[PDB]
């Protein structure tokens, strides 16, 4: 579904302009989409600085883009109303990069049947097919899960689908708008001879005996052990969760059989950063004591320190026992370096130890907060599936809470709530231009194969409610009464998001649910600086 | 371990000359090595035709090459005596393409320990390291399995190893000379922006519900079913063989519940050939009748029949029941086409069906013959581990037999025997310049991830034995008496190969043994046309 012709290729770095017609939330979402390209492709984006051909993103009618580099100078790409979704931006830029819709493939009739009699009159022009002399599928099979594939209802007249998948099980699969599919990357990365990405650094699941090049320190008291189980926990690794026999390993620091203060250090291979900011993430399991801790250091190398200088970046203490726990550690390294995992036994009694698995490192921004939902499957489609996150404080001081609604039969909804907080007396009301990004984590061991489902909203301080109040005003003024889990009363403002965050079927696909656990990643950022672009 | 500098890159297609000093067997092995590059990389090779810089392969002392395009015009690469091994040629050309040995990495001391007290005087320079200002490891961890990594005995004085891997399990792993490692390809394909290969077409294991783009035909009597088990067999697929719970699927044609002559047709996606010759391979399981057959067709597309005209290429009949069977089908397609699998029920009664799994298609030469060894593990290191293949006939008419000796404690040996045959009266004796290629198949589901162990020998008609006879003379004249399994007597000539075909440890690694089955692939080709190159 790629356009044939070297004249349609962009440079690997695309110049762009974010026109002022774009909504605030749209501008932030667009910049997020660029981050995804930087993680999984060799395509990059930079502000236009006089280049002849560039992309002008503006709030036109609908979401659309030309296919390929048209070399017309200013090439328009429309992110109109309701197009402010990261998957939609990725989709539109795949058009710009030279891709038609998946159902436009020359072989599309072998996999889907277009119901022309059920298309709305005047809408049949979007269901075209391109022959193999102008369209090249790059030796990749037809991809129902493509982010460039319409859903079954596209431009439908009535309740009857316009696109019918011959493999009936794919009827509701087509139309996913979560992230690149594996084939989307295969085709794009092939079309642009992509050898590496900007933001990806390392992914380690310990499934090979060389443990991703990590080295055991000799100036310590114990070694991390590559094991597939620990008696007291965990019974299996996090990557496979015991699915495959003889597979599924993790590194374990046995704190039960060492003295207080003893340490085991595991250091990563040498890494060369390109951006100056990184996010280190990994899953931890604690079957020992709450006094045991994991310390993260950064060993930076320079001409001044050829041996490398250590810097403590985070101490992870009081680790919950009995379940895998996701952690994020923010880094700001600019020189070649290693990551250091030091497991230290505390004074408390331990009968197990610390386990680490599914490590990923990328030159990306960490999420500000994480919502970890245990025993999640019971709530899908259940009346008691009305879930509220713990209270969090945004970077600017606003207290907020997340509402995830799984009670309805087909769709899951997610909403961002402001709640009463300790800084409300000194905060700006109504909440102005705070972009809340909510991401349902696709818990694939490899960050490169994650199709996380992400939606963003921006608080508009002029939005009002039916009774005349400002929607994002101080929760004590406009919010309803709510009770914390501990019984403490608080005020919860209006919730804003979408009732169509993710379908229950997609929620049960891939690795959104893993170990009956779900993780929702949260970032609340002031984007008022995007008003002028 | 890659050399830094854009001037050290070759063109993707390297011009080469095979000097007349090269041994006959070496010339054939080199051309075989090129086929591996064409299968797994974007590197190609063409005979030198006046290009300024080209590679001149000649029979120097030992096996060596410069690192990278040195832009000195004629750049020599030595394949001397005993260097005529496909993995050694691949290794030497990885040098030419710009790679140092893996243990020369700047971080090599974190993974291996050099026992300097054990190096031969004057050979310690061979263990030097290149810093990261001239060497780039391309963000790939240290690779013990690299084809560019010395074995533990390199330049050793005595019986004690010079290179000790700090992860002890890799002590005997380093030094593998079977094929590219996965990391070797990751680095090379990254260094030359390889987006695709010349010879790879498709790999299908049916592990995704879209079944690699294969189509179910409507003009037949039944459908192939994507299943993970069949009551009468097989109990699991061939890819995973029940290793992973809920995973491992194959396509099944149920002959038990259809009439005589009924067919189920599965057609592949559209394919575009580049070379004019292809090899289709796949694994079959038969739990039905001995009269059931699998027919392979090719649907070629042309201006004459836009719908496509079918051509029968092979009829697979009398399929042994109760075990997975590997098949190879030779193709000669030059226009865009599909592969067509037609399962046909015979007249016999059936309680099962035909199963197909782990299909691979590449623009490569099929092996002429295959030796399938059942219940293989019992013979490893056993006194009764002296195995003889069935008799085969080479393309020129010579009858031959393969001898695999597993009785030695550490090494497996393989030998090529000429045997008495029905054309011996009219054959040229002594056997002149017939190259026998013996390949222990690494039965990975994906052909692209196979590290098959291959050795080749060429019959020298002047080679003599101690008693004055020609080694490769007519077996009736110079051979010993032997009995086929059915009791029929024949004459077996001398066996030539190596007692160090593969170590037992490597033999038990990866997928050489799969389902307790081993496949040895055989090609005997006249290479007398290579005397003048
Ligand atoms: C115990 O087990 C033992 C081991 O299995 C077993 O021994 C085997 O017994 C069987 C049965 O008796 C023997 O089978 C015979 O094999 C012969 C050899 O076949 C191979 O070689 C053929 C000839 O190749 C030459 O010609 C080709 C082109 O024609 C060239 O491409 C070659 O380069 C080669 O040229 C060279 O040789 C020429 C001299 O012949 C010379 O002029 C020329 O210049 C050059 O030097 C190939 O055609 C043949 O390929 C076919 O068969 C194989 C099967 O293995 C397939 O895989 C191939 O795809 C292809 O189909 C082999 O490579 C055969 O000639 C002989 O065939 C004849 O008979 C059968 C059965 O009736 C017919 O199907 C066939 O058409 C032939 O019929 C012709 O001849 C007969 C008279 O001979 C005649 O009646 C008929 O009308 C017609 O004229 C037969 O298959 C086998 O050889 C034995 N193996 C060994 C190792 O010895 C033993 O019996 C068992 N014991 C018991 C008790 O059961
Ligand atoms: C039942 O459950 C409920 C639900 O949890 C419980 O309710 C909680 O109870 C606890 C304890 O009583 C409360 O803790 C208190 O929290 C407040 C707020 O913390 C957050 O904000 C801090 C201030 O942020 C402002 O300032 C920073 C710079 O200082 C700035 O960067 C920010 O952007 C923000 O700026 C804005 O606000 C300013 C006014 O404050 C303006 O001037 C400015 O212009 C801006 O408008 C912040 O410091 C803090 O960050 C730290 O802590 C978090 C979490 O611990 C951590 O993640 C960070 O890394 C930091 O380490 C938070 O973001 C806090 O101010 C209180 O601390 C003060 O008081 C104590 C006691 O004297 C001192 O020790 C401190 O030093 C400090 O002086 C206190 O921690 C919590 O707020 C409350 N939650 C809710 C939702 O109600 C309830 O208690 C439970 N009931 C029972 C019975 O158990
Ligand atoms: C990906 O790499 C290929 C191979 O180098 C590039 O193809 C070349 O493009 C130039 C510019 O038009 C042509 O003159 C050459 O003939 C092409 N070579 C081949 C073998 O086709 C291609 O341009 C690269 N893609 C991008 C997006 O840069
Ligand atoms: C692989 O592609 C890269 C582009 O990403 C090529 O690197 C460029 O090479 C040209 C010419 O040598 C230089 O002018 C550029 O500065 C390079 N750009 C970058 C980003 O490195 C490289 O030449 C290609 N390699 C091969 C073997 O074709
Ligand atoms: O693919 C697109 C959007 N698509 C139409 C569409 C709209 C809603 C749902 C679906 C679906 O998949 O269910 C598809 C085509 C298009 C082309 C030009 C203009 C507009 C417009 O928005 O007016 C829309 N954009 O690139
Ligand atoms: O790398 C190699 C092989 N050679 C380097 C070499 C080349 C030419 C001459 C000599 C020499 O001094 O005679 C040595 C090192 C080697 C040889 C044998 C076994 C192993 C091993 O891996 O054990 C390593 N060529 O590119
Ligand atoms: C949609 O279908 C209805 C029912 O056939 C018809 O009345 C109407 O005109 C159609 N509208 C369009 C835009 O196709
Ligand atoms: C929620 O409801 C589901 C379905 O009715 C039930 O299985 C589950 O136990 C309930 N959860 C809690 C925490 O009560
Ligand atoms: C090898 O070691 C032996 C044992 O000490 C020594 O006598 C000999 O000189 C050494 N040879 C070389 C070439 O290092
Ligand atoms: C060969 O010997 C091994 C062990 O010595 C034994 O397990 C196997 O069954 C034997 N195979 C035979 C006798 O065919
Ligand atoms: C030697 O090689 C040339 C070149 O291919 C070939 O034509 C010739 O026949 C070969 N010699 C013999 C005896 O086959
Ligand atoms: Ca793991
Ligand atoms: Ca240690
Ligand atoms: Ca399979
Ligand atoms: Ca059918
Ligand atoms: Cl992530
Ligand atoms: Cl193969
Ligand atoms: Zn589109
Ligand atoms: Zn070498």
Author numbering:
A (entry chain B), B (entry chain A): 62 to 594
Give excerpts from the publication:
Each monomer spans the catalytic active protease domain (Asn62-Leu259), the MAM-domain (Ser260-Cys427) and the TRAF-domain (Pro428-Gln595). Both monomers are covalently linked through an intermolecular disulfide bridge connecting residue Cys305 of monomer A and B. This feature could not be observed in the crystal structure described previously. Each monomer comprises at least three bound metal ions: two tentative calcium ions and a catalytic zinc ion. One benzyl residue is directed to the S1-site, while the second benzyl residue of the tertiary amine is directed towards the S1′-subsite, shaped by Arg238. The unexpected interaction is a fixation of the benzoic acid moiety within the S1′-site via a network of hydrogen bonds, i.e., the sidechain OH of Ser212 at a distance of 2.8–2.9 Å, the backbone NH of Ser212 at a distance of 3.2 Å and a water-bridged hydrogen bond with Thr214 at a distance of 2.6 and 2.8 Å. The closest distance between the carboxylic acid and the guanidinium moiety of Arg184 is around 4 Å, albeit the electron density for the C11, C12 and C13 of MWT-S-270 in monomer A and C8, C9 and C13 in monomer B is not defined, and the moiety of the inhibitor is probably highly flexible via rotation around the single bond connecting C7-C8.
Meprins (Meprin α and β) are multidomain, Zn-dependent proteases. They belong to the astacin family and metzincin superfamily of endo-proteinases. They are involved in a broad range of proteolytic processes, among these connective tissue homeostasis and immunological and intestinal barrier function.
